[PDB]
Symmetry: D2
Subunit: 372 residues, 4 copies
């Protein structure tokens, strides 16, 4: 498997696994990493929905950042300054729960710029992305204020770009040769969208969540990589959640995209490569889902799980697994020492600072060796 090894002390070429941080990205290349593929029910094997897109022109994007996904993002060895642009398909916790963790961790770990967040509006102000992030920053005000005591607050801001969720395939970002368009999803209530990323002859579609709709098959047509929700079977709903049959059947027809519907949809789209996600990917669930899909779609398919990676180039769309460090660490970026705002008042009161314990004797031994 992998490229032929030509040499005893050299590097193995075209490796059968993707080791994050080991492979340069070609100027006509895209890398997409599934940093979460699961559900609002949490699990070590699957973080909630998250995707990292890396373009050969050096731009990077996170599309969705659900609960748990930061552990996988952080295993990528990408500096925090290269991941400042996040697109949200919808405001479910399994699609933006870890925004706070990228916000606070990336700032404790030297992001110098503010985060930038694109997400949809709702039917009214309290149902949209601008309200959502504004209240998230208030929810975390203690964190924000205490950390801004010692770190310039500028990376602590979130610049929100809200767009009309009703818009049919309209441009929502246009920068440095890169476009995103959105269209609507049919999912729990008005607001949710899917995205298409256009750059340099490629199209990458992030379906978010939806029941099957008329918009996706139209605006996703001919994508290099087409991502779409694909649900657990009605039999699995009966077995895993003890649903009675009526309600089990309806989940796969009214509320979600069935495996058989996902097949219908990607048959219409004819992408280079289709990606099914948002099911629990276990030894007793996956096979009936892949069969549901094969009933109607025959093209190349990935059955997504965490740390699956796609390399998009002119000749091929290639699926591999990323082999990344469980014991992850922050990895430094180029950026320069950004200064705290020393007008910032302390958030301690003297009542608390009065309780400091004297540990001089306990610490003298290691201090003296370390200062030596």
């Amino acid at each position: 498997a992998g490229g032929k090894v030509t040499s005893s002390t050299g590097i193995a070429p075209k490796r059968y696994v993707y080791y994050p941080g080991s492979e340069e990205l070609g100027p006509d290349e895209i890398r997409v990493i599934a940093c979460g593929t699961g559900m609002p029910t949490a699990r070590r094997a699957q973080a909630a929905a998250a995707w990292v897109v890396e373009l050969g022109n050096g731009d990077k994007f996170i599309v969705d950042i659900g609960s748990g996904s930061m552990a996988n993002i952080q295993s990528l060895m990408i500096p925090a300054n290269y991941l400042t642009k996040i697109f949200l398909t919808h405001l479910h916790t399994d699609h933006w729960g870890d925004l706070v963790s990228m916000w606070a961790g990336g700032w404790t770990a030297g992001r110098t710029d503010p985060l930038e967040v694109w997400g949809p509006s709702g039917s009214r102000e309290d149902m949209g992305t601008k309200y959502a992030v504004e209240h998230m920053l208030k929810a975390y005000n203690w964190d924000y204020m205490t950390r801004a005591v010692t770190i310039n607050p500028r990376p602590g801001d979130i610049n929100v770009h809200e767009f009309d969720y009703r818009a049919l395939n309209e441009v929502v970002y246009q920068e440095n040769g890169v476009t995103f368009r959105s269209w609507p999803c049919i999912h729990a209530g008005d607001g949710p969208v899917s995205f298409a990323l256009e750059w340099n002859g490629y199209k990458v579609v992030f379906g978010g969540d939806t029941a099957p709709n008329i918009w996706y098959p139209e605006y996703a047509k001919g994508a290099d990589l087409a991502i779409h929700e694909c649900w657990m079977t009605s039999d699995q709903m009966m077995t895993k959640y003890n649903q009675p049959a009526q309600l089990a059947l309806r989940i796969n027809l009214d509320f979600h995209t069935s495996a058989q519907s996902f097949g219908q949809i990607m048959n219409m789209v004819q992408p280079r490569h289709a990606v099914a996600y948002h099911f629990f990917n276990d030894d007793d669930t996956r096979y009936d889902i892949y069969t549901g899909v094969r009933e109607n779609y025959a093209g190349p398919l990935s059955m997504a799980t965490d740390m699956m990676v796609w390399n998009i180039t002119r000749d091929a769309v290639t699926e591999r697994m990323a082999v990344s460090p469980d014991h992850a660490w922050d990895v430094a970026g180029p950026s320069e020492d950004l200064a705290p705002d020393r007008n910032r008042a302390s958030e301690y009161t003297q009542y608390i600072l009065d309780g400091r314990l004297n540990v001089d004797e306990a610490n003298a031994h290691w201090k003296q060796e370390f200062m030596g």
Copy 2:
């Protein structure tokens, strides 16, 4: 290792690892599980701070619920309706980041009662837990409002019990023979606290985060199990965070509790068993932290990592690892049907319902087979 097997077809007794869901809790026993032991930097091997406490009277509490920790809590096979009470030591993201995932996950998992959260005030209103949780719920208003259309909203409520952070070892909870007391910490800014849980002659101490203070040594004294922050060494601050020598030194003295400070503290406390946490627990980090602690403390010690478990009985405090499913699922509890509230408006507009794709043909096959 473990209890001796007595029969071919029987159960292996006193198993050398804890398999969650497989062991009865006796009436004079406590089980504590580390569901997060790490940092604001995410990694698959260590979720951020979270502790599950189970008492032999049937009460269960969560103390802290940091980013990523829900994946570990969910692997315990405890119905979400048994984990409704949550204690927060402070409002850093690595201590309450997964409250949202508990709130949303727990409600798709059929929690039927509101969450109940105890945490500290701050030095003004927008720095305490009541303000934080109230704005967390607004931040997720789309999630809340769309979910309540389909699921009775009573479980989607959060009753916050905000207590005075300034109070010195006061009761913040007292029910069914169980007491929680709080005292302050010194950490980033006013608000953070440590807890002591008292029940049936046991005392369990959850230190949260702090620089060394005069209160913990006094109010944790004699604990069966005492947990306290234990920082990565100043050499590791240089190696890993390429810090200059000066700021590397000050981290372990001013901002955080060094391993040597932790040993001094636990030497003052004389617990049956001390627990060091909140450091990256790796092959090249753990041993110098251990050595620092042993400079000043000789008693029983656990170097925390995720899914470590302590069983506290009259005769012993035992450390084990928990071996739990990575492919976790919600497990059902005994509660029942909440009679959904009819008085909730749909959050769809006709404009979005009009987009539904006809998928009758694609689904007819599985659909007619299933309806057997």
Copy 3:
């Protein structure tokens, strides 16, 4: 998932994963665990072929014990004295490589009876199981003779029960109402067999390795659980091994059982449950293998991987995953202390015993403390 929980302090019933050592085996129940499902190419995800069968009457058997598999066998928390009976399908390293690990490990771990091995003859004496194990014992004579100085040697014996590979579904083992039968396979050269285990109205078939043959579909018929070789695709041979097309084609026709052949076979057998094994079970291999089977077989199917388990009862054959300790330990059983032999010459010469370094000083401190 799993049984409904009834009690805060109780055990979760009918758990959705199998924790080895945690479940009582009923009198009319069988448990089968895949302790290896892989190839002669090694890999942490998949040990080479091995199966553990546990019967409700207390009897346990290993069928195949390939390289790597003892790590999975050891995770089951089953005392060494309960696993003294081993059946080999054939004499490839990936089917008996860890026999020597069981022999040596289970003797240093208080096995007190000799191992018992059943395996096939070959066309001549040096091509059968008796010859193979006789020479395995000679290969490890240093390990044998040195161990026998300090441990009673009786359990270091291996009693081989060689049976006629040519026989057509004839008994090779009969004891305590348990029968094994053998029939031939077509695999590299004369010798390899498949087994059926009969007990208490159950039939479990262990296919071993073969190209498709007329015997398996006839003699496996109606099995409760039927295991058979199922090969990676001819396309996968070109991608993964760089086979030129024509050789890749013959591999799934002449030498191995194709996924499509596997499905024909199981269509003829009509087992209550089929098991495909002995392919690399990866995110980019498994789905086309499963499609292959489903071209011709529609019944219950497991795509085996390591630590998969089947529970066989009158009502159901259930597939689960086993969640087992990675940091495994031997667990003691109810045997009795066996007496060493003093008619045993030391394997040391004075030349070596004279090399001992005095270490009394370095060991003084711990030594004094331990003796109180």
Copy 4:
């Protein structure tokens, strides 16, 4: 942690983990990977003893190849033809049990040259390495003869270089500017040795197994990397194996090298870096073993577990963890395939070949697609 990233599309330099196959080895550099660190008791966390050594001149050696270690060796993406030279410290199953898996899997992984094995004599012919390997090859006669019909059998050979176990520090290998020296161990019976590898001004010492001896501290002096056995504490012997105190005490004096003896030895040796191995490296064992080493030795130390890696340079010896694929595959080398000799007997009878099942129909469909 690790080196500073300088571009979005480029390669993370001096990575904090070692990804096998991702890094150039320099002309004055050595890489050592622990491919097994455990015991005769099997465990997924720890294969039995094995070491891979990659020299900057491009030579590679395996020192010990214990049960289970080939899963770790195969994760290094090194062509089988580069790993033909194997040194054994002694003939316990946990130091050479996976030789048969290197012999058989390596040969089908592509090795074209014989294996070459160096190991000690014993006190008589039947206690030596030559006898051991000649009888291992007879044990796998069925595998060898059946495989050799389909191949040139040249790679199936194993040439043994047996050397006297009694020799003090004498050359047993001297080739291409690499030297190995052996000297004796005190372990179970006459015969075990330790090795030193010298190349290009560096020295690496593989202790194997021993009770403490006068030869290791003399001939290992000044090593860049010194590896020695270091046993679990006597309290751990009582807790984990239920040894009575007296027997537990002696295990760490008479039979094995205690943690404290290990520290004295490494104190005497003064290596650039010491490695302790051959203990169960668990959350509840490793801290008491480390402390034992630290009573007597305070130089750089590694507490081995599996897939620990050392890079040796002039200016440093860096410990890292390797992050390698669990779903490993063979990787092809330059070595080109050879001409057989149309002259070996088939091992099939027509009795067996007449049992082939006609699967033409079930396979015709995929067969057609493939023949494009």
